[PDB]
Design a protein around this ligand. Structure first.
Ligand SMILES: CCCCCCCCCCCCCCCCCC(=O)OC[C@H](COP(=O)([O-])OCC(O)COP(=O)([O-])OC[C@@H](COC(=O)CCCCCCCCCCCCCCCCC)OC(=O)CCCCCCCCCCCCCCCCC)OC(=O)CCCCCCCCCCCCCCCCC
Ligand SMILES: CCCCCCCCCCCCCCCCCC(=O)OC[C@H](COP(=O)([O-])OCC[N+](C)(C)C)OC(=O)CCCCCCCCCCCCCCCCC
Ligand SMILES: CCCCCCCCCCCCCCCCCC(=O)OC[C@H](COP(=O)([O-])OCC[N+](C)(C)C)OC(=O)CCCCCCCCCCCCCCCCC
Ligand SMILES: CCCCCCCCCCCCCCCCCC(=O)OC[C@H](COP(=O)([O-])OCC[N+](C)(C)C)OC(=O)CCCCCCCCCCCCCCCCC
Ligand SMILES: CCCCCCCCCCCCCCCCCC(=O)OC[C@H](COP(=O)([O-])OCC[N+](C)(C)C)OC(=O)CCCCCCCCCCCCCCCCC
Ligand SMILES: CCCCCCCCCCCCCCCCCC(=O)OC[C@H](COP(=O)([O-])OCC[N+](C)(C)C)OC(=O)CCCCCCCCCCCCCCCCC
Ligand code: SF4
Ligand code: SF4
Ligand code: SF4
Lengths: 317, 176, 54, 155, 115, 145, 45, 53, 209
């Protein structure tokens, strides 16, 4: 059985590593630059070069830091991102899970706690402020994310991720809840801490946010954690709306379709990263509580009476 | 004459107001920047391949100093000290001595780059075009004592860099 | 340039963007428009280069 | 042979080091704006495999660019000491190399080397974007030419 | 216990990464490197002083709202009951009640940053 | 039709670059697969190419030699192997190769262009170029008079 | 020989544009909305 | 957003390209002096200015 | 000018500024001492130290002057005078697109009433001048060093202050932080007494004495 676990964990790390290359290269091509191409052919050896150099870099333990608190958070950040990859309905899920999204949602909230704890554990202004901007960021997206999650799968029938493939079947789910996918996609942007909503990092405003005292290996686990988080939750939005067909006799046909769906969607995550300025976390909780919340109620009311509207209540099993 | 920059009151017409509402609800001007950025992605990058490829330059470029010499072989410098008097950072130190023959040039000609400014003032201050700003921007090094040259290396620099400047002053002698 | 012209700036013709709110958006907009008006100055300067010394 | 093995692990270490070194987003004077000139798509900082990180706990090579002053001095030494090893320093321009145009000034320390150890002295005032981009290359060659674990084996 | 096995493996694999990133890559600390970062200078001295919120009002409303959503999570199963009539009214009633509370807070200032 | 046109352009690229070995050589060392006319070849083995059809700044380029003055440089390189005659042509300070019109050859110019000798033992050292200024009175050789 | 320097062409350089040339792209707000429900209603069917 | 920075620094570098063409260096020209500019523009510089503008 | 070498003149402006020069003189005869417009159309008002705040107030307030812009604060130091530092203001009138210069004199010890109330721009210009020259002004809000090094003693721009300074610093490993020491240059400033020994301008020559 454990052979299945390593084949689920190990490829993600290499996939996360090669995300750093495309992060630095498609951005550059999207930016009149050529991207990393000096290390091996076209730079495909650069993600490896980053990995060892970060690992062989000196780890740093600031004097005013809480040692145990400084170490537990990076473990929590990377472990949750990696264990986040077990329950997806990728053709044959590792663990069938009745409450698939609740398992998805619960530890996604626990993921920010590693983001949360590292700020004060580093014991300085530039990380305490970044940690507290993480509070306000997850103040905003969490109060509404469950509402979108409930609305989209209310037509699915239950919380099981596997039933998503059956529910979509003929047509893309986005065709039925396109304003919900409008809600869902950029709210995931607001949790992955990407360019428009990366206040927890905050390159320009506060040097590095919840990373300032972090060095070498702790970052390597942190860098992989948030890169694993974006890909996984993008794979989540891939099945949530763009689920493809699955033939039981040929499960590999689903993988090729699903991978591109979560890959082209990923290119979007790199796409917004180049073109958009930064939300101030003032308007971040302002916007998600002024227009986002009152709207997401309306379609939530729309999406509950409507299965009753046309006698289209989905079966739970 | 002036041009007002920021005031255009939007029309409250049904067609115009639903334009702004559609722009607000459906991100349209927001995707405009997103959409054009795609178009700029497909543009081939304007990156050179250093050092296999090097950027454009001009004959009147200022680089490392190089003391040249006459076609016979005698070094042009005649210790008029005008370069020292003009050098805005006093990077030049000059001492002179009549040695034996028609070759009294310098006891000492030390140009201090980490003090020098690369203004090039020494080049046009020289009445005999002895000290020149070479076309070589590529003279980096690892030790601080390296970044200063003696009189000898200025001669060696002028000896090593000779074809480039000889043609450069050939093309630029009328401009200055 | 307009109130106290210097050098040959009197002969050139251009516009100066004037803001209306004094906020960051106005200043950025005036900066953008000044660049466009700068290009117009280049066009007039390019087509009006006179002969003589330097 | 043990020396063969240590050399192979040595080759692995510096290749990752010189390929993935991260310059500091540190800029003081005229040199700083030309430093970001080569980071522009014309010369492509990133295509050589490097990316700008901000804090000392983040970067590899300090890139000192600009005039060094007495008031700037305490923070520069503090921020340099704050960078974990291995760490390298390159000195942009005549001013930071030593003294510079303001060598005789009352408020300029004559040399960044007087405050922080330096690997490479990149000259020019301002150095052309080509010249310092070689300075990064020379540091890649210098990082290549080490025997850190090799000298340890024979230590 | 399959979920336990992957959970144990996941936290284990994370611990090796921090383990060999703390012992293998050398060790050299001389105090000022170990010191906190204040953008180059020395901090005023704290990182423990009260960093008072300016959005404290919205934080508690999040607790009320994040709590009340747990009341409507059973919705997918609540749809498949023999009594969707009162189900529709009660489930609707909750959403208006959250809507009213959001509307109440909105009108009496609230969400905007308290100054 | 244009899609397969660029595919054969790549097929031409591997063929024109000395088959597979040369293409893998330039791809892994020269970092580029472009093919240009052989404009010149200096005495140091540095292979030079010119492609006027490409956009400005990528018309004239250099493939560095694998050997220079016992400083094997097949993998590592730097912007200083370029000899003085060609260094102006590479930087397009001019639109003439030295082959078309060689520079005026004189006695004192170097025959072997060198590079940055920094780090190597051939590196320069500052030294006094002046003689002694105050020489001391030599003590008498004779013993007590 | 006559004096020669860098000079504008005898007719002069071409007309240099400086104003905004921002495109007017997209479609009407009603059409964009009517499409939105149009595909939306298809979804529930 | 960082992309606008890299959009126009390319064009900013072209202005550096004519800068180095007509002056001694890229940035610090020491060109404009009391009594007039240091020396005349190179031939063909204005045409490049026309294309860039 | 048929000759293209020399700079032309704007006699209309020169007389016009001179008319306003005497204008201020009658308005405030207590404070102005002499008002002069230079050959290159620059009319300067020379006011008494103690009346610094009223004249600046008058130019900011009066309709006929309306000078409301503090262009620059300079206190050019001349060692040969008893009170060396001569504090020079710089004002621009937007409505009359003309520049005025009001200036006083003040030794190292005499305090001046700070002009921050009459010109908010004077605030930071005030923090710089006390730093470089050392002339304290009275009742300034937060008059304190804003140019020189933290704890740098001595006003560097003073005539008695050498250009190379008095101290230099260097990192020391035995104490593990930077530390100062007396300045000792690798190369001294080679003074260049290049002033021509022949008179350059008969017009500006001082009377025999
Ligand atoms: C619940 C159980 C809590 C147990 C406990 O005492 O936690 C202290 C722990 C460390 O406190 P700290 O503020 O980092 O101070 C550590 C040193 O005192 C101050 O820093 P330090 O550098 O002195 O830390 C090393 C120090 C203390 O040891 C450690 O820090 C090692 C890790 C904790 C071991 C217990 O080592 C020793 O004293 C010798 C150990 C042999 O505090 C916590 O909150 C950690 C709780 C972890 C619970 C399990 C989570 C999964
Ligand atoms: C943190 C771990 C959370 C685990 C979790 O939510 O599991 C849900 C799931 C939900 O299970 P379930 O509701 O899908 O039913 C289990 C049976 N299948 C999957 C076939 C339908 O829990 C389990 O599967 C139970 C096994 C583990 C029980 C012990 C967990 C201890 C966790 C300690 C931390
Ligand atoms: C390789 C990949 C190829 C495919 C890429 C697809 C995405 C990008 C398409 C091009 C960019 C969009 C168009 C643009 O920028 O300008 C044209 C225009 C610009 O419009 P506008 O901002 O000028 O306003 C149009 C309205 N009037 C004319 C009345 C003022 O784009 C649009 O109008 C399209 C709006 C898109 C809305 C996005 C959200 C909804 C998407 C569908 C549901 C999910
Ligand atoms: C995954 C990575 C796989 C390759 C790892 C190679 C080992 C890197 C360890 C970190 C660098 C230190 C090292 O190589 O040896 C330690 C050795 C430790 O012994 P040392 O004596 O050489 O340490 C340096 C000298 N002192 C002790 C004075 C600081 O150090 C070096 O090699 C650095 C020289
Ligand atoms: C698993 C979690 C490990 C958490 C601690 C990681 C670590 O090594 O921290 C450094 C700390 C300290 O590392 P250390 O013990 O090398 O630091 C001190 C070294 N001497 C004693 C030589 C000065 O690790 C343990 O305390 C087989
Ligand atoms: C936990 C620890 C796990 C350890 C696992 C063991 C292996 C780890 C490292 C594996 C990669 C080693 C590095 C190989 C590249 C390298 O260093 O090249 C140095 C050198 C660098 O040479 P260089 O220094 O001349 O390059 C830069 C200078 N220019 C640009 C001028 C050339 O390159 C080579 O040796 C060339 C061959 C490299 C081949 C790399 C693999 C190509 C195919 C990849 C396929 C996809 C893989 C995924
Ligand atoms: S450019 Fe020439 S004159 Fe100017 S400081 Fe440098 S060496 Fe001296
Ligand atoms: S280099 Fe030229 S200016 Fe300087 S001393 Fe020699 S001849 Fe005179
Ligand atoms: S060396 Fe030149 S360009 Fe660099 S900071 Fe000093 S004055 Fe500016």
């Amino acid at each position: 059985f454990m052979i299945n676990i390593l084949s689920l964990i190990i490829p993600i790390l290499l996939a996360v590593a090669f995300l750093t290359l495309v992060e630095r290269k498609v951005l550059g091509y999207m930016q009149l630059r050529k991207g990393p191409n000096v290390v091996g052919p076209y730079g495909l050896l650069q993600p490896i070069a980053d990995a060892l150099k970060l690992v062989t870099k000196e780890p740093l333990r600031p004097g005013t830091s809480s040692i145990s608190m400084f170490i537990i958070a990076p473990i929590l950040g990377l472990s949750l991102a990696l264990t986040m990859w077990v329950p997806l309905p990728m053709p044959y899920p590792l663990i069938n899970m009745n409450l698939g999204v609740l398992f998805m949602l619960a530890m996604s909230s626990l993921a920010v706690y590693s983001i949360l704890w590292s700020g004060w554990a580093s014991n300085s202004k530039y990380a305490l402020i970044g940690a507290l901007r993480a509070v306000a960021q997850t103040i905003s997206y969490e109060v509404t994310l469950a509402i979108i999650l409930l609305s989209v799968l209310l037509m699915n029938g239950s919380y099981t991720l596997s039933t998503l493939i059956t529910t979509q079947e003929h047509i893309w789910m986005i065709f039925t809840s396109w304003p919900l996918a409008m809600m869902w996609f950029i709210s995931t942007l607001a949790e992955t801490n990407r360019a428009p909503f990366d206040l927890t990092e905050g390159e320009s405003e506060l040097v590095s946010g919840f990373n300032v005292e972090y060095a070498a290996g702790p970052f390597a686990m942190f860098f992989m954690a948030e890169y694993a988080n974006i890909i996984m939750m993008n794979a989540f939005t891939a099945i949530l709306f763009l689920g493809a067909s699955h033939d039981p006799h040929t499960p590999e046909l689903y993988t090729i379709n699903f991978v591109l769906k979560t890959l082209a969607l990923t290119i979007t995550f790199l796409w917004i990263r180049a073109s958009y300025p930064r939300f101030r976390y003032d308007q971040l909780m302002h916007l998600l509580w002024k227009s986002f919340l009152p709207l997401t109620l309306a379609l939530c009311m729309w999406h509950i009476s409507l299965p009753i509207m046309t006698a289209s209540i989905p079966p739970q099993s | 004459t002036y041009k007002f920059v920021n005031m255009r009151e939007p029309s409250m017409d049904m067609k115009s107001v639903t334009d702004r509402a559609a722009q607000t609800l459906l991100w349209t001007e927001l995707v405009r920047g997103l959409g054009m950025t795609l178009s700029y992605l497909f543009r081939e990058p304007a990156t050179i391949n250093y050092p296999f490829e090097k950027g454009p330059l001009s004959p009147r470029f200022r680089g490392e100093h190089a003391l040249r010499r006459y076609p016979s072989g005698e070094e042009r410098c005649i210790a008029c000290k005008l370069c020292e008097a003009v050098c805005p950072a006093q990077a030049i130190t000059i001492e002179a001595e009549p040695r034996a023959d028609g070759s009294r040039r310098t006891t000492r000609y030390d140009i201090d780059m980490t003090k020098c400014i690369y203004c090039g003032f020494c080049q046009e201050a020289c009445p005999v075009d002895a000290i020149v700003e070479g076309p070589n921007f590529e003279f980096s090094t690892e030790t601080h004592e390296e970044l200063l040259y003696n009189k000898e290396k200025l001669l060696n620099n002028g000896d090593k860099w000779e074809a480039e400047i000889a043609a450069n002053i050939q093309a630029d002698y009328l401009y200055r | 340039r307009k109130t106290q012209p210097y050098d040959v700036y009197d002969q050139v013709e251009f516009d100066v963007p004037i803001g209306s709110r004094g906020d960051c958006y106005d200043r950025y907009l005036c900066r953008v428009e000044e660049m466009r008006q700068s290009l117009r100055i280049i066009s007039q300067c390019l087509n009006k280069m006179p002969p003589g010394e330097i | 042979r043990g020396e063969y093995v240590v050399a192979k692990l040595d080759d692995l270490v510096n290749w990752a080091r010189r390929s993935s070194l991260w310059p500091m987003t540190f800029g003081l004077a005229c040199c700083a704006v030309e430093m970001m000139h080569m980071a522009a798509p014309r010369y492509d900082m990133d295509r050589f495999g490097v990316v700008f990180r901000a804090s000392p706990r983040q970067s590899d090579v300090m890139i000192v660019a600009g005039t060094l002053t007495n008031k700037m001095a305490p923070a520069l030494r503090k921020v340099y000491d704050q960078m974990p090893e291995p760490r390298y320093v390159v000195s942009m321009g005549s001013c930071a190399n030593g003294g510079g145009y303001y060598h005789y000034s009352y408020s300029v320390v004559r040399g960044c080397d007087r405050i922080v150890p330096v690997d490479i002295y990149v000259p020019g005032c301002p150095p052309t974007a080509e010249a310092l981009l070689y300075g990064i290359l020379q540091l890649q060659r210098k990082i290549k030419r080490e025997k850190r674990l090799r000298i340890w084996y024979r230590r | 216990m399959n979920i336990m096995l992957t959970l144990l493996t996941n936290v284990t694999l994370a611990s090796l990464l921090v383990l060999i990133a703390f012992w293998l890559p050398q060790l050299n600390a001389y105090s000022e490197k170990t010191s906190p970062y204040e953008c180059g200078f020395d901090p005023m001295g704290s990182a423990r002083l009260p960093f008072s919120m300016k959005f404290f009002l919205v934080a508690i409303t999040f607790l009320l709202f994040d709590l009340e959503i747990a009341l409507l999570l059973p919705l997918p199963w609540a749809s498949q009951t023999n009594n969707l009539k009162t189900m529709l009214t009660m489930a609707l009633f909750l959403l208006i009640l959250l809507a009213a509370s959001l509307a109440y807070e909105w009108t009496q200032k609230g969400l905007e940053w308290a100054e | 039709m244009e899609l397969v046109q660029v595919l054969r352009r790549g097929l031409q690229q591997v063929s024109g670059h000395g088959g597979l070995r040369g293409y893998l050589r330039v791809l892994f060392r020269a970092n580029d697969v472009r093919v240009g006319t052989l404009v010149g070849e200096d005495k140091y083995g540095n292979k030079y190419y010119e492609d006027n059809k490409q956009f400005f700044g990528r018309h004239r380029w250099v493939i560095y030699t694998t050997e220079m003055n016992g400083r094997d440089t097949f993998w590592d390189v730097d912007g200083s192997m370029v000899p003085p005659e060609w260094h102006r042509w590479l930087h397009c300070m001019t639109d003439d190769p030295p082959t078309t019109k060689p520079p005026t050859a004189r006695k004192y110019i170097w025959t072997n262009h060198k590079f940055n000798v920094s780090g190597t033992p051939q590196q320069y050292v500052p030294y006094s170029t002046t003689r002694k200024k105050i020489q001391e009175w030599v003590p008498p050789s004779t013993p007590y008079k | 020989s006559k004096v020669k320097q860098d000079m504008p062409p005898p007719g002069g350089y071409g007309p240099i544009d400086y104003k905004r040339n921002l495109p007017r792209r997209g479609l009407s707000g009603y059409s964009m909305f009517a499409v939105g429900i149009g595909t939306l209603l298809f979804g529930y069917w | 957003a960082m992309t606008p920075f890299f959009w126009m620094f390319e064009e900013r570098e072209k202005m550096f390209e004519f800068y180095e063409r007509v002056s001694g260096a890229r940035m610090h020209a020491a060109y404009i002096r009391p009594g007039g500019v240091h020396q005349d523009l190179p031939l063909g510089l204005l045409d490049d200015i026309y294309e860039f503008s | 000018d048929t000759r293209p070498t020399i700079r032309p003149r704007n006699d209309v402006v020169h007389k016009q500024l001179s008319a306003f020069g005497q204008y201020v003189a009658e308005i405030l005869p207590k404070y102005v001492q002499q008002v002069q417009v230079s050959c290159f159309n620059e009319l300067e008002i020379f006011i008494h130290p103690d009346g610094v705040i009223p004249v600046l107030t008058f130019l900011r307030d009066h309709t006929n002057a309306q000078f409301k812009s503090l262009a620059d604060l300079t206190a050019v130091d001349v060692p040969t005078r008893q009170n060396r530092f001569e504090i020079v203001y710089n004002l621009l009138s937007l409505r009359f697109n003309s520049r005025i210069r009001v200036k006083t004199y003040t030794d190292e010890l005499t305090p001046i009433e700070s002009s921050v109330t009459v010109y908010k721009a004077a605030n930071w210009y005030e923090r710089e001048i006390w730093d470089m020259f050392g002339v304290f002004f009275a009742n300034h809000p937060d008059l304190r060093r804003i140019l020189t090094d933290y704890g740098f003693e001595g006003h560097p721009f003073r005539k008695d202050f050498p250009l190379s300074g008095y101290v230099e610093l260097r990192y020391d490993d035995e104490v593990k932080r930077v530390v100062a020491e007396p300045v000792e240059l690798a190369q001294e400033f080679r003074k260049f007494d290049l002033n021509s020994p022949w008179e350059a301008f008969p017009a500006y020559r001082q009377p025999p004495e």
